[PDB]
């Protein structure tokens, strides 16, 4: 397993990453991950049934989709905030627990769909996404970005890979990933 590896895994023939057709898509059952422009349109998201949402990008920045808790007040909608950065330094691993618990806790939930969603659903939120099925649904790194990427369009930034590496090393080790 190297960042080289998952490089590869997130190119098309060609040698290149691809990019998001649509605003967003179901990427497991029950999880969606998409762009600031769906997570501002309450109608959309509940004709998708969203009763979660997950700002991987919450801040001010044209970076980040400056939304919070209140904006989905009287929706029915639970929110969580992450103020997350998209560069290689930025360290979100940091977030993977809090990130993995709020979407176990959506999906617990009967009729639960959670969306984790950045500015363009490209990097923060799917390396969430990753995170938590390697954590909670015992997937290797290596399958879980491959199911994400067969259903959105994605490419995190090698740092993200780099701490994706680092987590399924650890997992490994612990056995914790055999599903
Ligand atoms: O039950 C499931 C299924 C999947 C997907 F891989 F099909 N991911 C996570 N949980
Ligand atoms: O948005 C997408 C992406 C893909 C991928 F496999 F190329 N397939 C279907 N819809």
């Given at each position: 397993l190297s960042v080289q590896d998952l490089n590869d895994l997130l190119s098309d023939g060609?040698?290149?990453?691809?990019?998001?057709?649509?605003?967003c898509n179901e990427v497991t059952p029950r999880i969606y991950v998409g762009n600031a422009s769906v997570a501002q349109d309450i109608p959309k998201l509940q004709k998708l049934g969203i009763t979660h949402v997950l700002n991987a990008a919450e801040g001010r920045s044209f970076m980040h989709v400056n939304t919070n808790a209140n904006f989905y007040k009287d929706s029915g909608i639970t929110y969580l905030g992450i103020k997350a950065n998209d560069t290689q330094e930025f360290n979100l691993s940091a977030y993977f627990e809090r990130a993995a618990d709020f979407i176990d806790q959506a999906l617990a939930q009967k009729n639960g769909r959670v969306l984790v969603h950045c500015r363009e659903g490209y990097s923060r939120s799917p390396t969430l996404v990753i995170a938590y099925l390697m954590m909670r649904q015992k997937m290797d790194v290596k399958s879980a970005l491959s199911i994400v990427?067969?259903?959105?369009?994605?490419?995190?930034?090698?740092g993200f890979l780099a701490q994706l590496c680092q987590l399924n090393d650890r997992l490994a080790k612990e056995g914790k990933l055999k599903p």
């Open positions: 060609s040698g290149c990453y691809s990019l998001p057709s649509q605003p990427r067969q259903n959105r369009e994605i490419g995190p930034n090698d």
